[PDB]
């Protein structure tokens, strides 16, 4: 099983490793042993489906600060903290007209997401690790 001998379009034999031509079949079998051929051979989804949804009504407490939202949530009994994310109003269940604003939505596993519309372009930062906190003892989550 030699992977270098091939057949050309003229009924001949071709060695692709040394790139040599051979007319008869007896010259291809005698070209495997030699000084050139030996030198050429030597050189070469589950978490989303299991999410329970009863959707209770959350209670948020917005307040204009100066240098913040205080949403009271019940006990979730899990290590997963509730996460906030900024989304656009272009995607919706009914797609109503004139939607050109953004919404910061906070979501948790045993509760429904609560969204606040932001008409301004940029007045704060919606990052999770940068400006949010969640006290597990008092079940209070805040974000500024």
């Amino acid at each position: 099983k030699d992977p270098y001998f091939m057949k050309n379009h003229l009924g001949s034999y071709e060695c692709k490793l040394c790139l040599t031509l051979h007319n008869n079949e007896g010259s291809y079998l005698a070209h495997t042993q030699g000084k050139k051929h030996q030198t050429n051979l030597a050189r070469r989804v589950e978490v989303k489906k299991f999410v329970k949804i009863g959707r209770p009504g959350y209670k948020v407490t917005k307040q204009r600060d100066s240098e913040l939202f205080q949403i009271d949530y019940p006990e979730i009994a899990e290590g997963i903290m509730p996460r906030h994310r900024f989304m656009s109003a272009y995607e919706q269940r009914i797609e109503p007209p004139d939607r050109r604003w953004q919404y910061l939505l906070m979501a948790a596993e045993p509760y429904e997401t609560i969204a606040f519309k932001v008409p301004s372009r940029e007045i704060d930062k919606a990052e999770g690790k940068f400006w949010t906190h969640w006290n597990r003892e008092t079940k209070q989550f805040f974000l500024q």
Binding site: V51, E91, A107, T113, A115, F116, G128
Partner: peptide, 17 residues
């Protein structure tokens, strides 16, 4: 685990109160 939970939550159920 928080990144897996954040990437699997529904972001289309918006509720404005």
């Amino acid at each position: 685990k928080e990144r897996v939970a954040y990437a699997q939550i529904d972001w289309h159920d918006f509720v404005v109160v």
